[PDB]
Ligand binder design. Structure first.
Ligand code: HEC
Ligand code: HEM
Ligand code: HEM
Ligand code: HEM
Ligand code: HEM
Ligand code: FES
Lengths: 51, 379, 79, 148, 60, 238, 379, 55, 79
């Protein structure tokens, strides 16, 4: 994978890191909401009113 | 470089089937039901699977297992009544789809029409055995009557009936046979539906005008994906109404008593989607004649493409043919209503007349009327 | 097979369109739909309704006749 | 998303424990039906549950066990609430086989699958078992009744 | 003077990742609020009939 | 000829109306004190009352009030136990033949699904219980049969089970025949459909969600199809 | 005019799949097993279906129903032992197929190889759930151990295992769930096998030489249909030998006692086609490490294509790689034997060494040996 | 009321004890195993049964 | 895509065949088959067998060692 070791690829990673972080946040929020984890949802102000 | 959606094999199949498929732009809401059928099928599998995780096909535990599903399993009632009413929704969509095919001359797709007839028979068998599964009074006695119909076959009727029964009558053997067959058949239905779409995509879809629409084709995805999603949402609304406000509307109360081989229920009738055929079966006093009429009632769809005599494909431009079609639909409603009703003085004669009218309209009246329309149009 | 590249030969047909974000989703929804719905209903009513009217008449007559048949016949008990 | 989450959650929940299974989560054992020096096995949570009416001699010998010389340091007094009654889950810690009562070299339990030896208090004494038999949570409602 | 919808598009809906994050957060909060409101409506309609309305008379 | 039951204005016949759990409690008292002697509810356990009409301790007290046969002991013979909320409602008779022998050859049906097993449901049950009448002229009933116009055949082997002050309600409600019949029919409706209230709540939620979604998905479809529905086509031959 | 075989849609698919498919002329008997697998699958679908006509999935009627099949159902023992030994034949053919893929470098078909790995996982799950259906001692306790493995997953292990159990342990809920899943999964296996063939036909088939054989392609029908028929006949000979002379050779006798949750059998071990994995599972003293090693022992097939450091595709011209491959095969046999054997003084150390050798050969020794071979050929 | 009848071919071989607890009580706490599959449920089969009986 | 006609380019290769009804299905089955089998066996016996021979040795030692372990140790019962 040495082909992908270059300044252009580091620039690409810089460009797509915000998008990857946003998608990771989307995945985390979706997982917490779907599973009703309640380990994280206890901290959310209005949601923790439930249970 | 290339486009994955157009080059990858599975992506090629999916794109050519559901994404880039050229679709007529004028197809109405009556073309949604096809996709609806698929949805129903998928539902009838998913829901069905989650019923098999708790159902046990034993005469000593089948009814108790169903009560356990509807009493103890978390949201088991939701799943059970979704299954029960989804079968009725499946048959509603099937009837509407066959009506759409008859009206707009979609039967000219011979291979698609024949695979559809096979699908209809397979779905009817699956629903029959699935209804036998709960092992209530209605299930047991409807199975008894429907299977006993096969005894009318000459010289092999008794042997065939006792082979299907797995014994001398409907009993535990028959219940387990029906559970296995009911489990396995929907996957054969999915394979047949895949073949059905394969045959349909060979020539594209029809349209209300009955005229080739190659000059006006649109990508299937952006328009008909959302249109079919809206149709599925409406179907889900109707189904959820039936499952959350009248879960027992289309069922029969006598199926909530455990099967009693020594005591027939007050009335023995099948599920509503079979009643019309049942009605035809009761028109003929002869048992073999009744069975033959029942089979022909569905096999007439095979003859439908050959009976087409009009120069135009769709009925959109044939008012007399439209009147005949709506007479046929009202006749089918009459047959269903009578199949619900007992065998008494007015119902017998009305059912005989209705069956005669059904066969007359499909066989005699429609081709003659189409020829009359052709002569009126000077061709 | 049948692909958008080659379906039919068409010549000298011009189609003007608009972006979905430049046009209203429901333009004149009621003021044009209601007359159009009425037109379609007027066109299709004479073709659709009469068979169902006949079915309803047959249904009512059959129900009435069955209910009458279930009723007692006085003449059977003259003696 | 709301509708899909509700549907998927209901379908998933249908696969979890049913109402009757949860109803059979904790059971009642009548201590008067267990004679002295008898380890009775009950079907609890789908697994064997050992309730032994430990005798005075067995209580004394278990109280005399050298705590530090045990693979898992435990005391009989801290292992059980009532000295004369010991309640354990009949699942060997080694792999999960069912120990047989009064079969080991220590007079307690013996897992034959490999050869684990437990005392009358469930503490591992000999064999390959890494831990002691689990003690489920329980309380004595009355003198001759226990709920696990 | 951008409108509310213009602000929404510029901040959240323009980028698909932010669009999906907004959808997820909205799904969470909408689920909470909708469940609370629907339960309130249902319990008001059946006021005095549900067990939670009569359990106090039997709780200890 | 048969008589169809009237449509009584039950408090649960509303589109989103639930059951009166006080009526459910009174109907359960009626069941345990009147029809439990001959009728059975196999598919209803005491644990099913915990969240409906009795608290957990009250349900335990109800369960402990009736002895239940337990599994074999060390000697290998069955014994009796005070009972627990995991048990189902006791069978009045061991086998249906015993029930027929004790009820002149008529099997008292199981009441777990009775409202769901009879046409008319609670309406039919209420009309049957309160509908007992003196047989009209010309009706000759066999020994041990009673005339109920709503029962098919009008000759039912069940003697009128309820009457004024048949049982004394714990709630203090007057024990009129109509009140007892209404309460027991409400309880039997609960037994047939133990998910009645939850089903109504889910139906309300799904109605709200569909009313929210259908216009929205319809608007999405219109947004996508606006391109085609505004499309103007012209033909320009040379 | 045209040719119906080359024109009709379904006929087009069949002709391009099994009739006019260009196939290498030199593929040895090791290329039969693929078709054999399909045969086995179909057999398991047919035979199993006929077992579902008499099997009930209730703990009170599971073992009794199996004995009813074996004693009362006409030729029921034939079908039951056909199923039992056909699972073993399926796994023999699967292992030989994977070995053929490894030896001849067939994993260079990335999509085909990955679909094959998914198929292997699905078939293993299907067989595991099916072995629980008889509800014998071995079925119950093997299910107990294998499912309890899932409890080693951190955080969500207990909730996951209890969700799969349907309760607090293996009980009626688990039995019914497993029956439903066991019924449904083989149809998913058929769909995945169809996708697998779709991916394979995109690039043709490999040959023992490992060299592209487009110059020497032959029609598939006249040659490989008869060759696959002969292979299926030989496989059927072996399977019928197992069914009719040693039906219980591959099954532990302890599964003929009804499940006793209160008493463990003298020895607990899964079926032979899992023993090797079981062996690796017991090599790691840590529970989570053992489960991870078990999963990796089959996920390593995914890594296989990425570890190919040889200039030549097939091991036919790679003698050192052949030695390593046969060391791997002998190591797998050793792992199976150890998994059969109890956990005692010699077996523990031999199993640990065997697991280390397996992972070392697949991950370290094979690529280094391939590089050395490349150097020796002056590539 | 339950009763006893002479018996017929359709009947299976009579059980010696009503329930396994009775068998254990009558056999010093040991349950006599069912012999319908005893040869097929034991390593050795008829060989094991013969050796056990004669040894 | 993958059909006879465009798979590859081959030139100047002449192939001679025979009808299956003009030739013997088992030509020199044993006269040439048996020597050929021996050649194939000899080429592979030193690459396939040696790994399996090691397994047999390990299997025998493990079985013997397991037996010896279960055997009584006289020294343990001394004194
Ligand atoms: C005297 C014993 C007895 C009592 C007490 C009793 N039942 Fe019944 N019940 C019977 C018998 C016997 C039948 C069936 C008679 C027949 O089928 O001819 C029956 C039938 C019924 C039916 C109608 C079944 C049908 O097929 O129509 C209902 C409803 C019913 N019982 C409910 C109740 C309710 C509610 C109560 C309490 C108010 C009750 N029973 C009390 C003995 C009893
Ligand atoms: C086109 C597909 C199907 C149709 C039309 C259909 C139809 C039916 C019907 C009408 C019933 C009667 C339910 C009732 O009256 O209570 C039923 C029951 C049942 N079906 Fe199917 N079914 C289909 C697919 C499936 C599948 C795929 C499975 C399993 C994988 C399945 C499993 C069951 C079970 C277990 C029952 C009994 C449970 C119950 O009755 O509540 N069904 N089916
Ligand atoms: C499980 C059963 C069925 C499934 C899943 C199914 C599926 C579909 C789908 C998805 C379509 C495309 C959408 C459409 O054109 O409306 C379609 C079209 C069609 N189907 Fe079905 N269908 C089923 C039953 C039937 C039956 C019973 C018939 C006829 C008796 C039939 C005949 C046709 C025809 C002729 C078309 C083409 C319609 C046209 O192009 O105008 N199908 N089907
Ligand atoms: C790849 C496909 C399949 C495999 C590998 C497989 C494997 C197995 C195995 C190993 C058993 C245990 C038999 C025993 O221990 O006696 C079994 C039992 C069973 N299987 Fe299959 N099976 C497959 C497909 C099916 C299908 C498609 C069905 C039903 C349509 C089915 C129904 C059954 C039933 C009912 C049993 C229990 C009957 C008995 O144990 O004798 N199986 N299966
Ligand atoms: C139910 C399971 C499976 C079925 C039904 C199946 C079926 C087939 C068939 C019919 C072929 C073509 C005939 C042949 O090449 O011998 C094939 C080829 C192949 N299979 Fe599978 N297979 C299965 C599992 C697997 C597994 C577990 C793997 C690998 C881990 C795999 C990898 C391959 C590969 C790489 C080929 C192409 C080999 C070549 O062309 O030289 N398959 N399979
Ligand atoms: S499994 Fe219990 S000591 Fe080995």
């Amino acid at each position: 994978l040495s082909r992908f070791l270059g300044p252009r690829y580091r620039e690409l990673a810089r460009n797509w890191i915000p998008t990857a972080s946003m998608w990771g946040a989307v995945g985390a929020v979706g997982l917490v909401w779907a599973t009703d984890w309640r380990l994280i949802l206890d901290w959310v102000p209005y949601i923790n009113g439930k249970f | 470089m290339t486009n994955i959606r157009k080059s990858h094999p599975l992506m090629k199949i999916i794109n050519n089937a559901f994404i880039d498929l050229p679709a007529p732009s004028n197809i109405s809401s009556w073309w949604n039901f096809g996709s609806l059928l698929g949805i129903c099928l998928i539902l009838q599998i998913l829901t069905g699977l989650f019923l098999a995780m708790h159902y046990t096909s034993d005469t000593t535990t089948a009814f108790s297992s169903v009560t356990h599903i509807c009493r103890d399993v978390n949201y088991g009632w939701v799943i059970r009544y979704l299954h029960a009413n989804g079968a009725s929704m499946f048959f509603i969509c099937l009837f509407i789809h066959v009506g759409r095919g008859l009206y707009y001359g979609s039967y000219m797709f011979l291979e698609t029409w024949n695979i559809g007839v096979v699908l209809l028979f397979t779905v009817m068998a699956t629903a029959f055995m699935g209804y036998v599964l709960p092992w209530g009074q209605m299930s047991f006695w409807g199975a008894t009557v429907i299977t006993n119909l096969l005894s009318a076959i000459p010289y092999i009727g008794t042997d065939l009936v006792e082979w299907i029964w797995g014994g001398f009558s409907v009993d535990k053997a028959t219940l387990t046979r029906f559970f296995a067959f009911h489990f396995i058949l929907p996957f054969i239905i999915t394979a047949l539906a895949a073949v059905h779409l394969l045959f349909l995509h060979e020539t594209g879809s029809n349209n209300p005008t009955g005229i080739s629409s190659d000059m006006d084709k649109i990508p299937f995805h952006p328009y008909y994906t959302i249109k079919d999603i809206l149709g599925a949402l409406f179907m889900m609304l109707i189904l959820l109404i039936l499952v959350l406000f009248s879960p027992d509307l289309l069922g029969d109360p006598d199926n909530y008593t455990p099967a009693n081989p020594l005591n027939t229920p007050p009335h023995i009738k099948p599920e509503w989607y079979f009643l019309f055929a049942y009605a035809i079966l009761r028109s003929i006093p002869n048992k073999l004649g009744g069975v033959l009429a029942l089979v022909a009632s569905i096999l007439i769809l095979i003859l439908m493409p050959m009976l087409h005599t009009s120069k135009q494909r769709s009925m959109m431009f044939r008012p007399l043919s439209q009147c005949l079609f709506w007479m046929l639909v009202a006749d089918l409603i009459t047959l269903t209503w009578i199949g619900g009703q007992p065998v008494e003085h007015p119902f017998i004669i009305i059912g005989q007349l209705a069956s005669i009218l059904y066969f007359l309209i499909i066989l005699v009246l429609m081709p003659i009327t189409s020829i009359i329309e052709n002569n009126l149009l000077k061709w | 097979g049948r692909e958008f590249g080659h379906l039919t030969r068409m010549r000298h047909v011009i189609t003007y369109s608009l972006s979905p974000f430049e046009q209203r989703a429901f333009p004149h929804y009621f003021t044009k739909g209601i007359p159009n719905v009425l037109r379609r209903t007027r066109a299709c009513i004479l073709r659709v309704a009469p068979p169902f009217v006949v079915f309803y008449l047959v249904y009512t007559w059959g129900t009435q006749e069955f209910e009458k048949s279930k009723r007692k016949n006085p003449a059977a008990y003259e003696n | 998303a709301y509708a899909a989450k509700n549907a998927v959650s209901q379908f998933v929940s249908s696969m979890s424990a049913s109402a009757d299974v949860l109803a059979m989560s904790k059971i009642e054992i009548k201590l008067s039906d267990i004679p002295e020096g008898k380890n009775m096995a009950f079907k609890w949570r789908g697994k064997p549950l050992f309730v032994r009416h430990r005798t005075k001699k067995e209580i004394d010998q278990e109280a005399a066990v050298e705590v530090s010389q045990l693979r898992d340091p435990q005391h009989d007094l801290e292992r059980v609430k009532k000295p004369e009654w010991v309640i354990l889950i009949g699942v060997c810690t080694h792999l999960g086989c069912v120990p047989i009562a009064n079969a080991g070299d220590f007079g307690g339990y013996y897992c034959p699958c490999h050869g684990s030896h437990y005392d009358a208090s469930g503490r591992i004494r000999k064999g390959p078992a890494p831990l002691n038999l689990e003690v489920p949570t329980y309380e004595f409602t009355s003198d001759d009744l226990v709920i696990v | 003077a951008p409108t509310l919808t213009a602000r929404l598009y510029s901040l959240l809906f323009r980028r698909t990742s932010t669009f999906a994050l907004t959808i997820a957060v909205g799904a969470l909060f909408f689920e909470r609020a909708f469940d609370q409101g629907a339960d309130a409506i249902y319990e008001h309609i059946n006021q005095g009939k549900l067990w939670k309305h009569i359990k106090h008379k039997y709780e200890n | 000829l048969e008589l169809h039951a009237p449509s009584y204005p039950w408090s649960h016949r509303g589109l989103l109306s639930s059951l009166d759990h006080t009526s459910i409690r009174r109907g359960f008292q009626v069941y345990k004190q009147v029809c439990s002697s001959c009728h059975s509810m196999d598919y209803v356990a005491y644990r099913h009352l915990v969240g409906v009409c009795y608290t957990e301790e009250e349900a335990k007290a109800l369960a402990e009030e009736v002895e239940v046969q337990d599994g074999p002991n060390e000697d290998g013979e069955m014994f009796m136990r005070p009972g627990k909320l995991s048990d189902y409602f006791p069978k009045p008779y061991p086998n249906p033949e015993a029930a027929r022998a004790a009820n002149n050859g008529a099997l008292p049906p199981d009441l777990s699904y009775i409202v769901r097993a009879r046409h008319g449901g609670e309406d039919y049950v209420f009309s049957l219980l309160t509908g007992y009448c003196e047989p009209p002229t010309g009706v000759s009933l066999r020994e041990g049969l009673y005339f109920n116009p709503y029962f098919p055949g009008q000759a039912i082997a069940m003697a009128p089970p309820i009457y004024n002050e048949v049982l004394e309600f714990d709630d203090g409600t007057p024990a009129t025949m109509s009140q007892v019949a209404k309460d027991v029919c409400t309880f039997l409706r609960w037994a047939s459909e133990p998910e009645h209230d939850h089903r109504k709540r889910m139906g309300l939620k799904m109605l709200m969600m569909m009313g929210l979604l259908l216009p929205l998905v319809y608007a999405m479809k219109r947004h996508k199809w606006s391109v085609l529905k505004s499309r103007k086509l012209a033909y320009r031959p040379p």
